[PDB]
Design a protein around this ligand. Structure first.
Ligand SMILES: CC(C)(COP(=O)(O)OP(=O)(O)OC[C@H]1O[C@@H](n2cnc3c(N)ncnc32)[C@H](O)[C@H]1OP(=O)(O)O)[C@@H](O)C(=O)NCCC(=O)NCCSC(=O)c1ccccc1C#N
Ligand SMILES: CC(C)(COP(=O)(O)OP(=O)(O)OC[C@H]1O[C@@H](n2cnc3c(N)ncnc32)[C@H](O)[C@H]1OP(=O)(O)O)[C@@H](O)C(=O)NCCC(=O)NCCSC(=O)c1ccccc1C#N
Ligand SMILES: Cc1cc2c3c(c1C)C(C)(C)C[C@@H](O)N3c1c(nc(O)[nH]c1=O)N2C[C@H](O)[C@H](O)[C@H](O)COP(=O)(O)O
Ligand SMILES: Cc1cc2c3c(c1C)C(C)(C)C[C@@H](O)N3c1c(nc(O)[nH]c1=O)N2C[C@H](O)[C@H](O)[C@H](O)COP(=O)(O)O
Ligand SMILES: [Ca+2]
Ligand SMILES: [Ca+2]
Ligand SMILES: [Fe+3]
Ligand SMILES: [Fe+3]
Ligand SMILES: [Fe+3]
Ligand SMILES: [Fe+3]
Ligand SMILES: [K+]
Ligand SMILES: [K+]
Lengths: 514, 514
């Protein structure tokens, strides 16, 4: 029982074969060093640390999804558009997970039912020097079967184990875990779930999804979507101490129960002062320094893992990195594309959630109007995206003559193609927002800065598309960059010099001559 | 091959057994008499006309879905809420249709491949004296297989056969047929489809659906939904002259090809004057007198039907009737409920599209806020409903202490629970609307009054819910109608007199004592 099928170790072997893996044997400190090195090389190749300070049994990998190109190469996609379309198709066609025996699951080689000190086995890290606690943010929640209406859910939840085998469990209001906890908020028994660490890359990719429940509602099969993404079923295994299932090919597994009504503070400082929304926790998805809140507790009852001599791998990652941004926004883009295609097929050409747009904060859709009867569909798309993606603050629609991956080109569209009196939608003022946005959280006023007091401003949908029938007046003409060859005029040396001095919007403008 | 399984004849037998069927042998005139009698008994029991003027082979039934109570009894539902929930569940769990042999399909007992005069076999009717043409509005389009991405579509399309075997084909912009025609607008071959008449009641129920493509996108299985609604698979049969499938248990079937680029006028008058949007056609779904437009043509190549001595039944119905309203708004309500449940489960308690709200015009959702973190979800629901239901003009959200079926109670909520400065949403001004709404169609100005020139005003979402935490101040208290018994004070005669003098909002207020 020591082989993961399409597991993280196979991905590491593939990275090493492609030359995309950077290893080191120097001992890395989980306190400020892993996240520091990840931010120094933000959006770069994966880094594998063989020696982690005070964790002789663990290896740490980071920047696994830092470069979207290497991720697309790992999953067999040509480019971002191909990835979006293939992931939408996978969302509509899940692969049912397969259950294997308890004696052939690689993640159950070692089963610790006592001596449950999570912080001794799972690597907790500190992101910034301003933090006080070391937290665990590498595990994905896994709920399979009756508690998810016969489907399966996988997603990240940050945990702070400050009571040995009991830690806080951060749940986004409105998410799948929030819906499960709300349905069972007044039950007598706790919710049995497991946290998986070092899972297969497809499971991480699908766990990044969130707040796309018009496409991935409660009862869907997220593990099935991961299996369809990886081209084969994901293996499940029955837990040892609870009635649930786990990812058999993970590296660590925490079995336990979620107590919805047993809420405790995430940090000792906030627990002392007894207020939420202040007292920094660590950097969050909106790009701001974090805050600490009360949260339900996760009561661990068993710690399963691979053979400790094999040094099971854990994937710790800073929040404000290209890694986390890719992990969330990839399936977010695919789900937004699927929704727009459901509403009216053939109009949306591409969807992109750039790193700068705060994974749950905004998105960009590219629409192509084929005739006069399709004019106005971009506004329906913007309103539907803002309403079906809770707390999304800025959705932008652009035409097909726009480079959706260049923020400079988007800014140009905003400057030249937006009528400020009619092209700025504010669909749902007073709806549900995201508490982690400081602009929204500051609307609490003098109340507790939690989700119970914030007041959403309604989002912002910007229609920066060209009106149909005015494509000649809004034409970005072309420069003759294909009609002349620089080799006829200069030598290779000068051409390389001039090319090396180029960066930014000019790279996009020179490719298209636009 | 002469038995429909759960067909229209079985429904007629059930109605007769329950005493819900009203028969007559007097010859009814399809010109102004069928629709006149249907409007005289709007929302009443089904009427079966055994003798139709100039149609010795046809029987006509009307008001089949006129009373929602008899429909719910036919399909085995307790009430409207049970119907909505069961139909949502059926939408999420379709039954795959079964294919039967060409020699056991009841609808293929007689196959006319020549002498194709549709108006001689299919009963065309005139709705109002202001019309000039007699049109066919009893058949549902049926597209199965490759042209619907492996799914199945059923829906109504009004046809005017003024060229013998070639008639106009009215397609709503944005609908499933519109999406199919747009995908194949420039193909060389025409689109093979069939029009079914006198279909099973579940197929009519599902064909009533429209503009709910976040729940029923292109590629879904609408015939599967009908089968799940009726509790058994719907039978299909291979066509005779085209490569397609039809409802085997129908009464008539028109096989042919849809020519998207071969557009002709629906009436001779509009064809002469050569303008669209004027020159009345017949009453439409918005409750206004109709207009005539250009439309693609349906080229019939075969007319299959049951044995002409059995007098196959046809279901002609006026547009502005409780029948049509039920037929559309039932699955509309179920799909809106499904969408609201996908966005955030447990908040929406009931969805109702009243007759007065112009099937595609508006809806009412009833929300119950369980805690402070759910305040504001009604606005997300309203925005999502307005954006994902093309051209919807008025969505209203009310609290759980409201009778969703009483328009007086909704008006009371509008009067007392709407802040005009913050509770009226206008989410998507300039989006896609419905051309058949005169308020929208008048925005064309001096252009052609078609879908290419209308300018949607953005819809209207009214949040008439009670803010969370103010349920004591917005409490409709109760009167003690359960604490006193009228028999102790008056005799049965006076009680019946007083009860007979009551009607309207007082019936709802007296049941709840509110
Ligand atoms: C809002 C909340 C939780 C509430 O807590 P509070 O505002 O303090 O109010 P409350 O809970 O004490 O009272 C409440 C009363 O409503 C009843 N009630 C309460 N809940 C339920 C329920 N589920 N079902 C049924 N009834 C319920 C109770 O009946 C009663 O509570 P009880 O009396 O029973 O105790 C509040 O604490 C709170 O954490 N905000 C912030 C939470 C939040 O945005 N995370 C987002 C996580 S994204 C994230 O990281 C991330 C994502 C991507 C990338 C990087 C990162 C990072 N890096
Ligand atoms: C808007 C339309 C159709 C357009 O027609 P027009 O405005 O006149 O413009 P157009 O078609 O001539 O030109 C167009 C140009 O865009 C290109 N193009 C056009 N279409 C396509 C396409 N599908 N795919 C790709 N390209 C396309 C062509 O390339 C070029 O056309 P071409 O040059 O090729 O000919 C226009 O006629 C029209 O009927 N409005 C009204 C239609 C409408 O609301 N029904 C709603 C039916 S609910 C109903 O009853 C009902 C429902 C429930 C209950 C009761 C009732 C009743 N009782
Ligand atoms: C990639 C990544 C994502 C998340 C988190 C982290 C990483 C690295 C932590 C470092 C652990 C910090 C936090 N954290 C986190 C979180 N969602 C929460 O509800 N709670 C959390 O504490 N998301 C977003 C999740 O990935 C979403 O999936 C979300 O949970 C909704 O998912 P779903 O219900 O729709 O399935
Ligand atoms: C119940 C009923 C419904 C409709 C119609 C009629 C009846 C009796 C006519 C009397 C024939 C007049 C017209 N007519 C009609 C129509 N939809 C159209 O696109 N075109 C039409 O000429 N709808 C609404 C349809 O029932 C919808 O299903 C619509 O077609 C979209 O359905 P879908 O694509 O989502 O599946
Ligand atoms: Ca992205
Ligand atoms: Ca209705
Ligand atoms: Fe989930
Ligand atoms: Fe614009
Ligand atoms: Fe359809
Ligand atoms: Fe209100
Ligand atoms: K997820
Ligand atoms: K339909």
């Amino acid at each position: 029982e020591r082989v993961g099928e399409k597991d993280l170790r196979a991905a590491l072997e593939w990275f090493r074969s492609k030359g995309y893996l950077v290893e080191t044997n120097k001992e890395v400190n989980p306190d400020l060093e892993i996240t520091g090195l990840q931010k120094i090389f933000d959006g770069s190749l994966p880094m594998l640390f063989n020696n982690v300070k005070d964790m002789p049994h663990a290896r740490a990998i980071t920047n696994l999804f830092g470069d979207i190109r290497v991720v697309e190469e790992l999953f067999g996609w040509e480019n971002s558009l191909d990835r979006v379309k293939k992931v939408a198709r996978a969302i509509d066609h899940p692969l049912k997970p397969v259950i294997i025996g308890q004696d052939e699951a690689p993640v159950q080689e070692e089963v610790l039912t006592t001596d449950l000190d999570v912080n001794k086995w799972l690597t907790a890290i500190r992101h910034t020097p301003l933090e006080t606690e070391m937290t665990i943010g590498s595990g994905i929640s896994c709920v399979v079967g009756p508690y998810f209406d016969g489907g399966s859910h996988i997603g990240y939840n940050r945990m702070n184990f400050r009571w040995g085998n009991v830690g806080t469990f951060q749940i986004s209001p409105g998410s799948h875990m929030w819906q499960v906890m709300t349905e069972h908020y007044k039950d007598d028994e706790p919710i049995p779930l497991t946290m998986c660490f070092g899972v297969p890359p497809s499971c991480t990719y699908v766990a990044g999804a969130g707040f796309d429940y018009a496409i991935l509602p409660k009862g869907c099969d997220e593990i099935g979507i991961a299996g369809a993404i990886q081209g084969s079923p994901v293996r499940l295994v029955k837990c040892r101490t609870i009635d649930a299932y786990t990812l058999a090919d993970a590296e660590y597994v925490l079995e336990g129960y979620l107590h919805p009504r047993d809420k405790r503070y995430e940090t000792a400082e906030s627990e002392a002062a007894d207020i939420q929304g202040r007292f920094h926790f660590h950097p969050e998805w909106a790009g701001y320094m974090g805050k600490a809140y009360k949260a339900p507790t996760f009561h661990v009852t068993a710690i399963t893992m691979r053979r400790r001599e094999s040094k099971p791998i854990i994937f710790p990652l800073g929040v404000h990195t290209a890694d986390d941004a890719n992990i969330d926004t990839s399936v977010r883009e695919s789900a937004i594309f699927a929704l727009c295609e459901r509403l009216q097929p053939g109009i949306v050409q591409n969807v992109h959630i750039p790193y700068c747009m705060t994974d749950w904060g905004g998105c960009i859709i590219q629409v192509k109007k084929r005739n006069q009867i399709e004019e106005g569909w971009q506004r329906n798309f913007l309103a539907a995206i803002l309403a079906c993606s809770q707390g999304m603050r800025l959705a932008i629609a652009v035409s097909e003559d726009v480079d959706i991956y260049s923020m400079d080109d988007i800014m140009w569209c905003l400057t030249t193609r937006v009528n400020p009196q009619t092209d700025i939608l504010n669909p749902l003022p007073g709806g549900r927002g995201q508490t982690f946005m400081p602009a929204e959280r500051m609307t609490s006023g003098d109340k507790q800065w939690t989700a119970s007091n914030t007041q959403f401003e309604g989002g912002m949908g910007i229609d920066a598309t060209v009106p149909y029938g005015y494509e000649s007046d809004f034409h970005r003409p072309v420069y003759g960059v294909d009609l002349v060859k620089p080799e006829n005029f200069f030598d290779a040396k000068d051409i390389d010099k001039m090319k090396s001095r180029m960066a930014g919007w000019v790279l996009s403008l020179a490719r298209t001559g636009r």
